[PDB]
Amino acid sequence: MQSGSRPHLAWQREHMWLALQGLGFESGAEAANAGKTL
Amino acid sequence: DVIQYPDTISSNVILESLSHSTEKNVVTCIRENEELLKELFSSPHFQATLSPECNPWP
């Protein structure tokens, strides 16, 4: 009930997206590697 | 290198209470790093810097 969530850290989406770009992620090429359009 | 130069000698900020300075300086640096990383990573050049090649040769 008062069994609360720790705040859901928005930065763990954002530093995660930066980690993908740093590792050389392309939303075009890796979608094409899955046979799918952006 | 990490011992940044004294260029603007801000005379008073040498010994005012570090225990109420450090957390501000951490938050301001986290903010600088979020801005700098978000605006580095907005550049189209940001994969070429990380994988450089050059050919002047005709």
Added chain:
Amino acid sequence: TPVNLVPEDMVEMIESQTLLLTYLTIKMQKNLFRLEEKAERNLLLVNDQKDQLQETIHMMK
């Protein structure tokens, strides 16, 4: 007892920025040294051409 309630949620955040920065520096170093290594060899392979041509021109003078 005092409790210095500086959030862990910020200390793991700055150490996620440190990891981004140092990963990028190392990704640059290894790919840039590879460019510098062959850039010196490409200049040396053209100084070989300079030297013999300049010396041939000296004999012909």
